[PDB]
Design a protein around this ligand. Sequence first.
Ligand SMILES: CCCCCCCC/C=C/CCCCCCCC(=O)N[C@@H](COP(=O)(O)O)[C@H](O)/C=C/CCCCCCCCCCCCC
Length: 207
Amino acid sequence: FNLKVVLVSFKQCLDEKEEVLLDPYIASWKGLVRFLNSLGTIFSFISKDVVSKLRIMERLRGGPQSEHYRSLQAMVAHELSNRLVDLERRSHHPESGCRTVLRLHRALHWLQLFLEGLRTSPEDARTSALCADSYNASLAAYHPWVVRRAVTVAFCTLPTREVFLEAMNVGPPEQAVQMLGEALPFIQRVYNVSQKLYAEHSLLDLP
Ligand SMILES: CCCCCCCC/C=C/CCCCCCCC(=O)N[C@@H](COP(=O)(O)O)[C@H](O)/C=C/CCCCCCCCCCCCC
């Protein structure tokens, strides 16, 4: 089990017609949780939010309407038609299938930015400031200043640029960086598809 294993499991999230299958997506996320946890990081507390959300999508896929949660496209279609999404404010659907995936989608965005910033960096780069750039380019818009100003402090508990690279269990840093340019574009496709879908239906601002 390593980071390459995870990043190429996303290959399975996109069917032959470019739909995003739920079951692999969840499975791929159970791995990302697993990898987050393997780091001796303060940021393992957010893995309870992920697992929480992953269990949301697991009950929907397991419920009486399993078939509509086969894919994100199916899910969006079903939930928008049946009016099961709080488009305006949270009211009766605070745990919509749509908005839940939206949070993991945004999280998926910070990941590829950081992994890229990890890949295309000087070998003496501050990982705290790598993260801050990635964070401010993704999640920061959706977080209150209190969360913003504090999560920055916690970016300092982060290991070094090397320390991240061997943590992936692929070998020396220079061979982590090589696999990073090869295992990445699987998650980038899933993101891009999911991004397009959520944007076709004006769903990038679900509360
Ligand atoms: C070599 C890199 C290793 C990292 C691998 C991580 C793989 C799994 C993904 C990690 C990044 C996901 C972080 C969480 C994303 C936040 C999304 C979010 O907006 N959550 C919110 C949902 O709220 P609600 O809608 O009301 O239920 C929630 O309010 C916020 C919770 C978490 C806030 C903390 C912000 C995260 C800061 C940046 C992440 C740093 C990750 C640490 C690096 C290991």
